């Protein structure tokens, strides 16, 4: 339309109307200029061995992608207290993306001050993989997500990918992809963006705890962990992180199996263990990158599913003792919860064969899930010489651009009808009087989550 | 249309339908300001080269000029992978070219800083000759291409061409076009120009190699050269390299023989011998201008025509030997092929005759190939002094311009429809693992192109 | 690709992963370390699917 | 092999600005920043900022946001910190270092420092 | 900017362990590294990242890093080894921040 017209409205809201929810969200994304304009190839060889199982070759691309991927950036912490209190299930439906108000800036520095200033006419490049010919990196759980907090400007994370290797060294199946092949719409200062997706269709996530337990069909499926008690003393003295692993390996290259296939956490009562890589680990507010205590770090639990799925570091059977067992028939199993922090969908690999997909982290299974969004600005040469010269244009400008960002996603809802004649459990905070308010900005100007949340309250018969 | 509103999108897709393709290609460009706003007359002397060979006469003009006539800016090595594998042939259709998101920079220079700011109301101009009436460059395989690999961001060659000449002296014949002259387009920041072309019909490019020699009619016309070996202790201890060349002369000037008309390299199953000036020989990635040594370049070779066309090392037969060998009647030969580096079309010089016009160096010849595209920047005069001068201002702002560029080029396919029992040779990586993938960046950043690609892979019957 | 080798390789996750039961050579010196799953190591990532 | 080369010193009285130079050969040029760590006798080193190569914009560092002026120049592939008010205090031996990430995204340290440089200012 | 201790004791054949510290937004969101400076000639880095030794470094030097609290340990020392080390970091912004001047006495 125009520079002085505004492109976009600022929307966040949820809209609970009836089964359905309609849950909007808004922020603010800087994206700065990654890799100068230059795509390169990474890998860690750091010895002639390097690491056994942690080599790896790929590239990085200097696109950055949009990850929404967490339940976080969409619920308002009293939404999700309003959600799983009065509800069984729940399932995305569909998707809105809408971005606006591009501002583009120009950091020019002169006399020893550099001074920010509108660059009106250059451009900003985006586009979404809707073949999901790119490789899908919103899978892994990284950071790097929209902010939790609506007043926070966030920055934009970097688009690289990984590919096969030997050693730190690529085979000839490898594959290099240019984002820069795909067609994308190019942004100015006035215009926005904005595109809609229908999710497949997807079992409900079923947020409720059994009620009546199995034993009173056989157990799913267990694979065993070694049990660490948060109380240190009871912990062997020696250093079985590693060692003690559980741990699948391919290729000759071994993966800590994390969290593994659903299971209760612990046995009824002993609540101080957990298995090693068995549950997710969320870091507080502020705690360090490497090496934070123990209680710098939440630790979710699954002591719901115990009643079906079998305990995490107890043996499955005895026909000796069985540590793994897979499928027989007529085994029910539970899925792992899904947490507030915790991550939505995560794309289905694309295999000839693969047994119930929902993904060991948990969220919703899908073969097509939403785009990526890949995003970078349009390079903007630094002046070249008269001379003409057969090499590319080493030299830029240095540049940035920001502006918002909305998304608005479906979310569609089953009601609870249990005929239980006492109370449920719900979620509800604590009376009890505090330096601050939970779930809410200390005086610093800090947003800081004082717990996991899980899903799993309502309870059923089985 | 305005500022803030993006005039063109970024496009860069292949679309592989029944048998017809569509290559579509972007890049970024900056526009210098050569020759400093001013049309120049320059002679082998004001480069300073005293022989009679390289004499020549001309002008060197502000315009500047763009090139796709280059395979690899097209077609991505995927492509020139399933474009050849699976083909009998190939020609072009239909070329459309656009050129968007103009962007013009004023530099200023302090006595020790220049910063740069955006001058919205200057102006670029650009115009196509589409009568051809201008001298056409495109067809000497210049500098200068789009670049191969997206993300980089190229600076156009400047535009100069050649007349006639005596020595450094021109002769009153010898012509000079003012571009100016010729009518184009002016684009400030928000205007965008675009056209289209149609490709003249010209025979398919064939891309196979004959199973059945011919012997198994006559071979077709021979031009011999002096055979060069890749085993440098084979080779006589003499500098042979200007005096050993074959070189057809014009006007008193001795020019080397380059390629000269298809011949296979080497008899069969000899590779390490190559005509000295038959064939093309591409710098590697990172080679040096001057004195270069082996194996800093690719050596191209014609190997697969080894069953029409005679040895380019040989002699054509005995009547004595042959070294020379016009066209007789009844003759049969195939044409150079074309490589993912090499040349597209070059423009069938205007006679009242000629024969088989197709190009040496490989690729369509045509009698109106693809217009040339100039482009240049109108000078914004420095402020004037406030009493008159008749003279013309010599002050101007240093500006340069930026924005994009696209083309997309329809190629039409010919099947292959061969009964052969046995399977075919088909060009593929080489799975076995190296420090690099292949057409690929490297961890410094620059992109490579280890090996040319010839077309001929499929078999015909002769 | 690879299925252990899904995630990517620029940016850390959010889950942590045991790093240290120990603090050092001696006695009574059980302890517990957690750390950041990234690119750094990358066996450890917390990853949604097995072979 | 990839070198980073200061110039040599000077000797210059309070009140006096002095430039220093820094060439990188045998690289880019542009991917890389480039830090410049000060050491004042009988003081830690200290942080007189980074310019980017190709931006042209520097970070500079909360002490010396006043006095120190970065520039630098492509063609000749060197790169210049300009102290312009030095005074007894700021005397030091110069460096300039340049980030290398050890071809990966993650990691960041000063990989290639140059041989040296030092300043006396005295009156 | 980091605190670590200045003056570092040292015996031939002895490890040593070069402690720094700093707050979580300086140290805890960055890797610390080590550079060994010798007064007179260019510094060399030692140990980028908290366990990680460049090619050129010795097998010897390592580094052991804990939230807040980033340390160094150097294995069968000689006084041909003995210099000047520095804690280096990365903030928000990247600026680079150094803990301290920390040199050994070998004897």
């Known amino acids: 339309d125009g520079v002085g017209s505004s492109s976009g409205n600022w929307h966040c809201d949820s809209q609970w109307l009836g089964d359905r929810v309609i849950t909007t969200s808004t922020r603010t994304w800087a994206l700065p200029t990654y890799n100068n304009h230059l795509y390169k190839q990474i890998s860690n060889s750091t010895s002639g061995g390097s690491s056994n199982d942690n080599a790896y070759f790929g590239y990085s691309t200097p696109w950055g992608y949009f990850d929404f991927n967490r339940f976080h950036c969409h619920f308002s912490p009293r939404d999700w207290q309003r959600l799983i209190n009065n509800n069984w299930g729940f399932r995305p439906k569909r998707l809105n993306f809408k971005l606006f108000n591009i501002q583009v800036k120009e950091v020019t520095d002169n006399n020893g001050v550099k001074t920010i200033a509108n660059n009106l006419t250059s451009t900003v490049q985006v586009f979404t993989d809707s073949d999901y010919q790119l490789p899908y990196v919103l899978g892994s759980a990284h950071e790097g997500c929209l902010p939790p907090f609506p007043a926070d400007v966030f920055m934009i994370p970097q688009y690289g990918y990984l590919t096969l290797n030997d050693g730190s060294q690529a085979v000839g199946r490898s594959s290099f992809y240019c984002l820069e092949y795909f067609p994308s719409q190019m942004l100015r200062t006035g215009n926005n963006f904005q595109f809609s997706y229908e999710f497949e269709n997807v079992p409900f996530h079923s947020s409720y705890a059994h009620s009546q337990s199995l034993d009173r069909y056989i157990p799913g499926p267990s694979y065993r962990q070694q049990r660490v008690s948060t109380t240190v003393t009871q912990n062997n003295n020696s250093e079985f992180a590693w060692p003690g692993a559980s741990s699948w390996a391919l290729n000759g290259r071994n993966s800590l199996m994390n969290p593994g296939p659903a299971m209760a956490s612990h046995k009824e009562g002993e609540d101080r263990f957990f298995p090693l890589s068995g549950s997710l680990i969320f870091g507080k507010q502020g705690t360090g990158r490497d090496n934070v205590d123990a209680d710098k770090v939440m630790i979710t639990n699954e002591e719901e599913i115990k009643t079906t799925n079998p305990v995490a570091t107890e043996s499955y059977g005895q026909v000796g003792w069985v540590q793994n067992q897979g499928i027989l028939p007529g085994m029910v199993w539970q899925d792992r919860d899904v947490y507030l922090q915790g991550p939505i969908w995560a794309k289905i690999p694309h295999t000839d064969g693969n047994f119930h997909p929902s993904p060991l982290m948990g969220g919703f299974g899908m073969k097509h899930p939403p785009p990526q969004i890949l995003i970078k600005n349009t390079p903007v040469p630094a002046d070249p010489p008269t001379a003409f010269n057969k090499d590319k244009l080493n030299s830029f400008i240095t540049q940035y651009s920001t502006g918002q960002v909305s998304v608005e996603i479906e979310w569609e809802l089953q009601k609870e009808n249990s005929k239980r004649w006492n109370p449920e459990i719900q979620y509800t905070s604590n009376y009890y009087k505090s330096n601050n308010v939970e779930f809410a900005v200390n005086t610093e100007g800090v947003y800081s989550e004082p717990r996991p949340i899980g899903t799993r309250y309502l309870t059923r018969n089985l | 249309d305005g500022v803030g509103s993006s005039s063109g999108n970024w496009h860069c897709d292949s679309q592989w339908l029944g048998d017809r393709v569509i290559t579509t290609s972007t890049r970024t460009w900056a526009l210098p300001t050569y020759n400093n706003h001013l049309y120049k007359q320059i002679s082998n002397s004001t480069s300073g080269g005293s022989s009679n060979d390289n004499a020549y006469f001309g002008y060197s003009t502000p315009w500047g000029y763009f090139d796709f006539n280059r395979f690899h800016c097209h077609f991505s090595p995927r492509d020139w992978q399933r474009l050849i594998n699976n083909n009998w042939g190939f020609r072009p259709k239909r070329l459309n070219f656009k050129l968007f998101n103009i962007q013009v920079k004023e530099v200023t220079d302090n006595n020790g800083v220049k910063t740069i700011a955006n001058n919205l109301t200057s102006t670029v101009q650009v115009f196509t000759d589409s009568d051809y009436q201008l001298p056409y460059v495109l067809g000497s395989a210049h500098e200068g291409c789009l670049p191969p690999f997206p993300a980089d961001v190229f600076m156009i060659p400047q535009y100069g061409y050649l007349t006639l000449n005596d020595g450094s002296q021109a002769v009153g014949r010898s012509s000079f076009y003012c571009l100016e002259y010729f009518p184009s387009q002016m684009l400030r920041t928000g205007n965008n120009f675009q056209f289209s072309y149609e490709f003249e019909n010209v025979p398919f490019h064939s891309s196979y190699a004959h199973s059945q020699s011919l012997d198994r009619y006559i071979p077709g016309p021979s031009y011999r050269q002096q055979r060069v070996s890749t085993t440098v202790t084979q080779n006589n201890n003499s500098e042979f390299a200007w005096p050993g060349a074959s070189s057809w002369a014009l006007n008193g000037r001795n020019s080397l023989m380059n390629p000269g008309p298809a011949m296979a390299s080497h008899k069969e199953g000899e590779d390490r011998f190559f005509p000295l000036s038959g064939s093309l020989i591409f710098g590697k990635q990172g080679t040096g201008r001057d004195n270069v040594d082996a194996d800093k370049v690719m050596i191209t070779n014609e190997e697969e025509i080894k069953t029409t066309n005679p040895v380019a090392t040989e002699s054509y037969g005995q009547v004595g030997w042959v070294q020379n060998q016009g066209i007789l009647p009844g003759m049969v030969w195939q044409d150079r092929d074309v490589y993912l580096q090499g040349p597209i079309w070059a423009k069938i010089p205007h006679t009242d005759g000629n024969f088989h016009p197709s190009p040496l160096m490989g690729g369509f010849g045509m009698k109106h190939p693809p217009p040339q595209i100039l482009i240049k920047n109108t000078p914004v005069p420095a402020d004037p002094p406030t009493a008159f001068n008749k003279d013309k201002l010599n002050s101007f702002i240093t500006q340069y311009s930026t924005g994009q560029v696209s083309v997309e080029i329809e190629w039409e396919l010919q099947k292959e429809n061969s009964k052969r029992w046995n399977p075919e040779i088909q060009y593929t990586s080489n799975y076995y693992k190296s420090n690099n993938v292949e057409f690929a960046v490297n961890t410094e950043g620059v992109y490579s192109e280890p090996r040319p690609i010839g077309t001929r892979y499929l078999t015909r019957n002769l | 690709q690879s299925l252990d080798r899904l995630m990517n390789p620029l940016i850390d996750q959010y889950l942590y992963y045991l790093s240290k039961t120990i603090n050092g050579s001696g006695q009574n010196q059980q302890t517990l370390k957690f750390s950041v799953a990234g690119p750094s190591n990358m066996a450890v990532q917390g990853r949604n699917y097995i072979p | 092999q990839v070198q980073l080369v200061e110039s040599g010193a000077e000797v210059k009285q309070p009140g006096a600005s002095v430039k220093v130079s820094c060439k990188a050969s045998?690289?880019?040029?542009?991917?890389?920043?480039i830090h410049w760590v000060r050491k004042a006798p009988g003081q830690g080193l200290e942080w007189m900022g980074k310019?980017?190569?190709?931006?042209?914009?520097?970070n500079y560092a909360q002490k010396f946001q006043g006095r120190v002026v970065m520039t630098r120049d492509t063609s000749t592939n060197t790169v210049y910190v300009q102290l312009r008010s030095l005074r007894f205090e700021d005397t030091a031996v110069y460096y300039c270092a340049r980030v290398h990430d050890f071809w990966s995204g993650y990691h960041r340290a000063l990989d290639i420092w140059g041989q040296g440089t030092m300043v006396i200012v005295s009156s | 900017v980091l605190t670590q201790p200045p003056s570092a004791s040292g015996t031939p054949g002895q490890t040593v362990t070069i402690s720094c510290s700093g707050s979580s937004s300086n140290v805890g969101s960055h890797s610390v590294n080590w550079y060994q400076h010798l007064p007179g000639t260019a510094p060399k880095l030692l140990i980028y990242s908290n366990h990680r030794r460049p090619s050129g470094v010795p097998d010897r030097f390592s580094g052991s890093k804990s939230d807040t609290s980033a340390s160094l340990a150097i294995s069968g020392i000689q006084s041909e080894d003995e210099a000047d080390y520095y804690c280096?970091?990365?903030?928000?912004?990247?600026?680079?921040?150094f803990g301290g001047g920390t040199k050994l006495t070998v004897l």
């Open positions: 280096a970091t990365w903030d928000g912004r990247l600026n680079v921040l």
């Open positions: 310019i980017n190569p190709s931006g042209g914009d520097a």
């Open positions: 045998g690289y880019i040029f542009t991917s890389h920043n």
